[PDB]
């Protein structure tokens, strides 16, 4: 009833294909899952959850065997990933666009409780009128219920994006975890490069970063007001750490560049 035409890239469990209808030719993303089912109920139900303009919109579902099938919106404008050029980057006024409306996205998962836990450029999709997306929630969990926050006890992501306390504490707050990757996305979209392995006491670059040598690359590409930005979200310290909300208050974040 469909027709796998393409493979997309994989999902955190099994593959996403591009399938086109038989009757109709509409243009549809399916993530295959060949079945665990509290996971894959977990990530259902969140899929329910979700209606915001930078999040992917979520169509339904099917089981045959232990197959399940979501389907989701296509995003007809490809990765962000592919707007990286490498070493380069992309011009400031479109990364800080895509930037605005990352925010936007998070924002919105952050108010109704969801962490998305990896937040990184090949999760982030395009539109016709490039708008981002924000794709993917097989690793997203619930950190707030009725008003009380759950921190976080377990491991997972992409090593180059995930913040330093997840992998030395044993509980941490969410909030800050998707904000430090927000700025590895950021670093990677003005520089083309990513600044450091994985964000740990023997990794020599991060270290170089910790001790402020800006006159090292990536920085080096990087203009002055988006790196004053950058300071403040690379920070250590989760709790000093900047939060979104003064994240909407930075120079770089209100400066006037895109027609
Ligand atoms: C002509 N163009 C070329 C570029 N085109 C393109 C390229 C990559 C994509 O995702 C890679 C991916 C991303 C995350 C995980 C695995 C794989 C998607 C896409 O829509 N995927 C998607 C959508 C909704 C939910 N999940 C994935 C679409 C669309 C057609």
């Known amino acids: ?3 796998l035409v393409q493979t997309l890239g994989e999902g955190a469990y099994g593959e996403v294909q591009l399938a086109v209808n038989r009757v109709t030719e509409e243009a549809v993303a399916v993530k295959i899952v060949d079945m665990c089912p509290e996971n894959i109920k977990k990530e259902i139900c969140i899929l329910k959850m979700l209606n915001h303009e930078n999040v992917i919109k979520f169509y339904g579902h099917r ?7 979501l389907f989701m919106e296509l995003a ?4 962000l990933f592919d707007r990286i050029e490498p070493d380069i980057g992309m011009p400031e006024p479109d990364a800080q666009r895509f930037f605005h409306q990352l925010m936007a996205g998070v924002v ?27 794709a993917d929630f097989g690793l997203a969990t619930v950190f ?11 491991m997972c992501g992409t090593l ?8 030395k504490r044993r509980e941490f707050h969410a ?20 600044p450091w392995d994985q964000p740990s006491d023997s990794c020599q670059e991060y270290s170089d970063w910790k001790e402020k040598k800006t006159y090292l690359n990536p920085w080096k590409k990087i203009d002055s007001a988006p790196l004053a930005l950058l300071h403040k979200i690379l920070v250590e310290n989760p709790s000093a750490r900047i939060t979104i909300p003064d994240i909407k208050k930075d120079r770089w974040y209100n400066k006037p560049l895109k027609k």
């Not at 998962?109 to 450029?121: Q, S, V, Y």
């Not at 180059?160 to 997840?166: D, I, M, N, S």
């Not at 990757?181 to 083309?192: H, P």
């Open 175 to 194: 909030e800050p975890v998707d904000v430090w990757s927000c700025g590895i996305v950021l670093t990677a979209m003005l520089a083309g490069e990513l």
């Open 1 to 3: 009833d469909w027709d």
């Open 160 to 167: 180059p994006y995930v913040a330093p306390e997840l992998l």
């Open 76 to 79: 007809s404008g490809g990765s």
């Open 108 to 134: 919105y998962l952050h108010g109704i409780g969801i962490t998305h836990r990896d937040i990184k450029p090949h999760n982030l999709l395009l539109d016709e009128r490039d708008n981002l997306k924000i």
């Open 63 to 69: 089981r045959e065997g232990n197959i399940q099938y």
């Open 144 to 154: 707030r219920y009725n008003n009380r926050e759950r921190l976080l006890n377990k």
